């Protein structure tokens, strides 16, 4: 907030109108680039952290090849215009986006969006990760924070209450910090807990599979409006997993070094304990969750759980869920 401030031009370019985000990694703000002809930019003003010059550096890296290969944004990934140093900060300079899908949901009661909304999303946001997959890149921070709207616009109407629906459901894919390539060093852990997959956690080495996971949790909060992981302990965690999907592979468990979680090769869960019971009670079987069997429901859902299959091997791929059947009705 000491330089943030609103009217501030940046590197003498950028005039701060707005702060759009605030966290550990920094701030985005909305500015005006006067040399472009005042058009709105998101500026993402990086904390002096270590932990987020290194991202920093990377998301530039990363875009820099991903717009350059697509420069059009075919495939859906944000447009990074530049970068520099002001007041001794990296700053990343993007095309300007709506609200995140998660502002949406959050901003509309956390009523969840409808299934040809689901539809349209799911495909581009398989679509954007299928192309970073392509180019040997895993994106590992895959949630609704890091799926924006292209456009924010909704009409109104009575439903309850009022209703918001978007004018324009296309998104585009954000948060490039945390991408990896095959051939470079990987983070142990990695994504934000809700979205992280069975081996992330058992730290059985990651790829490509663990994005497809993380969208399989998406489209689930994207068709019932919250999560169906709401924790903040691996342990947990997995035996949410367990409830919701079934008992984890022996192999899986066997291989893991994460000896902590286990016992004799079974997850070592309290059912007698407060968590136990808040467990039990909060998730069940996967298909419990549908709120309709009509064909399509059936459809999204099929797909979801190849989507969180444990084995990442025998995970769905992106070119694969692509010619899934739930995308039928897109032609
Ligand atoms: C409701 C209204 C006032 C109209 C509103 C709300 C939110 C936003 C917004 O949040 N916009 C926004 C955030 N962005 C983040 C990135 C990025 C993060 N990491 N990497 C890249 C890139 C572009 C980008 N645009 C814009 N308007």
Redesign the pocket.
Do not use: P, T, W
């Given at each position: 907030h000491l330089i943030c401030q609103s009217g501030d031009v940046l590197s003498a370019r950028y005039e701060i109108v707005?702060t759009?985000?605030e966290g550990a990694?920094g701030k985005?703000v909305?500015c005006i680039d006067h040399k472009a002809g005042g058009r709105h930019?998101?500026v993402?003003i990086v904390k002096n952290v270590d932990r987020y010059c290194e991202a920093a550096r990377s998301?530039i890296q990363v875009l820099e090849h991903l717009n350059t290969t697509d420069p059009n944004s075919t495939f859906r990934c944000?447009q990074?215009l530049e970068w520099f140093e002001h007041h001794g900060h990296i700053c990343?300079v993007?095309?300007?986006?709506?609200?995140?899908t998660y502002?949406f949901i959050k901003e509309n009661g956390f009523l969840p969006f409808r299934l040809d909304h689901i539809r349209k999303m799911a495909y581009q946001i398989c679509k954007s990760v299928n192309f970073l997959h392509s180019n040997k890149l895993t994106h590992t921070d895959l949630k609704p924070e890091?799926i924006?709207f292209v456009q924010?616009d909704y009409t109104e109407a009575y439903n309850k209450r009022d209703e918001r629906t978007l004018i324009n459901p296309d998104i585009?894919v954000?948060?490039?910090?945390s991408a990896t390539y095959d051939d470079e060093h990987h983070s142990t852990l990695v994504s934000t807990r809700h979205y992280r997959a069975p081996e992330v956690i058992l730290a059985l080495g990651w790829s490509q599979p663990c994005d497809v996971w993380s969208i399989g949790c998406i489209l689930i909060e994207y068709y019932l409006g919250f999560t169906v992981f709401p924790t903040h302990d691996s342990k947990e965690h997995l035996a949410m997993m367990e409830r919701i999907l079934g008992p984890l592979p022996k192999h899986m468990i066997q291989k893991t070094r994460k000896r902590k979680y286990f016992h004799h090769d079974r997850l070592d869960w309290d059912e007698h304990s407060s968590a136990g019971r808040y467990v039990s009670r909060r998730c069940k079987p996967l298909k419990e969750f549908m709120l309709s069997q009509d064909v399509e429901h059936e459809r999204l859902f099929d797909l979801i759980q190849k989507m969180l299959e444990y084995d990442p091997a025998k995970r769905i791929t992106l070119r694969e869920a692509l010619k899934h059947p739930f995308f039928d009705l897109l032609k």
């Open positions: 707005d759009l985000g990694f985005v909305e930019v998101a993402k998301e944000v990074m990343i993007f095309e300007l986006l709506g609200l995140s502002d890091n924006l924010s585009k954000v948060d490039f910090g």
